[PDB]
């Protein structure tokens, strides 16, 4: 019944974290497990663009406010995001075709969310899923209308709104060192940072199939070679939840000096987006699964 967050702090890392929101914190044993075992919380949905600005200039913070207040009262660090992510856009954003108009909408969205929680958020995921699988930039509304400067603009705008935040770019399928996407994000982040773009971290959205944990041992050092101050594992779940896959991911974290922590996608299996693959660390009784105990043994 040991706390993985307490144990990973003992190994010199910052946090073992989890995604949650108001609808989980108010039912079952989610809050008790988060209180005991995790040191950082993220809003699964309540800070996404469609949740917070469902119509232009009309903001909804009730869910995000609840999460931030709960975390502060319970001694937890807070991550927020995603500020710019095409798959969470409300419909009104995608029909804007003017560069100046979309730039202003994007900056206003960033600045409004970050100002409301200024000083309270350790990490912001500023841009997500900006890359195609071949390493090219994904042709989203932001790329199509603003161009590739939208990423520099988003990060500079975020730094100005809350300079004490750690600003991350995140993506998925960065789990293999030989995959073109993994190399591409490293090379682009190096170029952006040399030009003064304030990218503090790369966050790897780590949705794994069985047996893919071993690859992260080589991919994570490659991500860290971009020279960002931090890297992190985000949104972690593993089909089958095998102890071997989870332990390999934890050990990749421990092996990479700049990796500050790990965030898992959720608490209990039935609430996973792929519950049929039983991919989390607690079962539907809110009891720890073998993978949880394997992490504990590994961290000791
Ligand atoms: O790590 N996460 O579980 C997580 C969840 C939702 C997010 N939105 N932006 N970044 C996120 C990270």
**What is the rounded (10 degree) CA torsion for 217, 201, 77, 206?**
-40
Question: What would you report as the CA-atom Rg of the chain, rounded to the nearest whole angstrom?
Answer: 18
Measuring CA to CA, which residue among 117, 109, 125 is closest to residue 17?
Answer: 125
209 vs 250: CA distance, rounded Å? 16
Number of C-beta neighbours around residue 187 at 10 A: 11
Mutation test of ligand 1: which of 205, 235, 273 has the most ligand atoms closer than 8 Å to its C-beta? 235
Residue 98 CA to ligand 1 center (angstroms) comes to: 29
Q: Whose CA is nearest to atom 11 of ligand 1?
A: 81
Cis peptide before 37 (omega within 30 of 0): no
Q: Whose CA is nearest to atom 10 of ligand 1?
A: 81
Residue 262 CA to ligand 1 center (angstroms) comes to: 11
Q: Which atom of ligand 1 lies closest to the CA of 18? A: 3
- Angstrom CA distances, 142 to 104, 120, 269, stand at 12, 28, 35
Q: How many domains does the chain have?
A: 1
Residue 266 CA to ligand 1 center (angstroms) comes to: 10
- Angstrom CA distances, 135 to 138, 167, 215, 274, stand at 9, 21, 19, 26
Structural domain range at position 103: 4-299
Q: Whose CA is nearest to atom 2 of ligand 1?
A: 235
Q: Which residues of the chain come before a gap where C and the next N are over 2.5 Å apart?
A: none
Q: What CATH number is given to the structural domain containing 253?
A: 3.20.20.80
């Amino acid at each position: 019944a040991q706390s993985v967050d307490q144990l990973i702090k003992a190994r010199g890392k910052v946090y073992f974290g989890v995604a949650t929101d108001q609808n989980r914190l108010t039912t079952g044993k989610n809050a008790a497990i988060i209180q005991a075992d995790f040191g950082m919380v993220w809003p699964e949905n309540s800070m996404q663009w469609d949740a917070t600005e469902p119509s232009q200039g009309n903001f909804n913070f009730a869910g995000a406010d609840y999460l931030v207040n709960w975390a502060q009262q319970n001694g937890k660090l807070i991550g927020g995001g995603c500020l710019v992510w095409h798959s969470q856009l409300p419909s009104w954003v995608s029909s804007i075709t003017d560069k100046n108009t979309l730039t202003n909408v994007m900056k206003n969205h960033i600045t409004t969310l970050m100002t409301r929680y200024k000083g309270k958020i350790r990490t912001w995921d500023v841009v997500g899923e900006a890359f195609n699988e071949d390493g090219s930039l994904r042709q989203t509304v932001f790329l199509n209308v603003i161009g590739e400067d939208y990423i520099p603009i988003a990060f500079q705008t975020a730094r100005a709104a809350d300079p004490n935040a750690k600003l991350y770019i995140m993506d998925y399928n960065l789990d293999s060192a030989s995959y073109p996407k993994t190399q591409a994000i490293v090379n682009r982040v190096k170029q952006w940072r040399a030009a003064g773009v304030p990218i503090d971290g790369i966050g790897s959205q780590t949705h794994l199939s069985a047996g893919q944990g071993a690859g992260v041992l080589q991919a994570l050092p490659l991500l860290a070679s971009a020279g960002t101050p931090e890297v992190s594992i985000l949104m972690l779940d593993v089909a089958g939840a095998s102890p071997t896959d989870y332990v390999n991911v934890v050990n990749a974290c421990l092996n990479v000096q700049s990796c500050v922590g790990i965030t898992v996608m959720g608490v209990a299996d039935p609430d996973s987006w792929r519950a049929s693959t039983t991919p989390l660390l607690f079962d539907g009784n809110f009891n720890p699964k073998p993978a949880y105990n394997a992490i504990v043994q590994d961290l000791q």
